[PDB]
Ligand binder design. Structure first.
Ligand SMILES: Cc1cccc2c(-c3ccccc3Cl)c(C(=O)O)[nH]c12
Ligand SMILES: [Zn+2]
Ligand SMILES: [Zn+2]
Ligand SMILES: [Zn+2]
Length: 231
């Protein structure tokens, strides 16, 4: 019953409960004449919520906050963006105006500035070298190395064995690469290997776009990235 791109009007946001205190949020956006889905994460931290990634733009992110209040009724106090593209930081200004403390790595913040995208206020330290991990409340943040972008982070929820791979991980229905202008193709499979080695216990894997699955999404993504490498 996971909502797919064809079910969600641009401007609407859906929530999908994965476990006690863990949801994904799903939105859609138009770009270059097509419509794409996008995922983020919501993790309960006591009586507050941690948000992972925006809903791709100001209008979607405003709807996201309204759906959170309607369906959960707890305040979003912190948000983390997992890389610098608009499906991760677009809407950060909406979050900040709502009193959310927005976070990203120094690398993400610099790349967002250069690209002209919205810049999360706070900086996540300790994530600059491949294999680095830091705790952030109810989650662990992990920098696996360059992949979809040089700055992409992954997020693990240990209480629920949920691994949020972000745009470094592809859904199964994507059999060809897309939006890889900022990627490091040569290192992407190695970065995926670091994820597998660090979170081999993950049970639920959430890509940046599309349907969740298991750790086989990591093998799937390696297959697709290597095929694009050899195009
Ligand atoms: C920043 C941006 C804009 C428009 C599309 C995308 C995709 C995408 C996602 C699903 C399938 C095909 C594509 Cl091109 C990604 C991504 O793969 O992370 N980012 C995007
Ligand atoms: Zn991206
Ligand atoms: Zn993406
Ligand atoms: Zn596959």
């Amino acid at each position: 019953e996971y909502p797919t791109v064809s079910e969600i009007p641009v401007g609407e946001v859906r929530l999908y409960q994965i476990a006690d205190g863990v949801w994904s949020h799903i939105a859609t956006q138009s770009f270059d004449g097509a419509v794409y889905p996008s995922n983020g994460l919501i993790v309960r931290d006591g009586d507050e919520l941690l948000l992972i990634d925006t809903a791709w733009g100001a209008k979607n992110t405003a709807a996201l906050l309204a759906e959170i209040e309607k369906q959960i009724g707890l305040p979003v106090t912190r948000a983390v963006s997992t890389h610098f593209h608009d499906d991760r930081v677009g809407g950060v200004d909406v979050l900040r105006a709502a009193g959310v403390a927005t976070y990203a790595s120094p690398s993400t913040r610099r790349l967002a500035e250069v690209e002209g995208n919205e810049i999360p206020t706070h900086s996540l330290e300790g994530l600059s070298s491949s294999g680095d991990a830091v705790r952030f409340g109810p989650v662990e943040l992990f920098y696996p190395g360059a992949a979809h972008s040089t700055d992409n982070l992954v997020v693990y929820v240990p209480s629920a064995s949920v691994l949020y791979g972000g745009c470094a991980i592809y859904e199964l229905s994507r059999t060809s690469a897309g939006n890889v202008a900022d990627a490091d193709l040569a290192e992407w499979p190695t970065s995926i290997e670091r994820i597998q080695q660090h979170y081999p216990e993950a049970q639920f894997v959430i890509p940046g776009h599309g349907l969740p699955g298991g750790l086989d999404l990591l093998k799937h993504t390696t297959n697709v990235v290597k095929a694009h490498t050899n195009r």
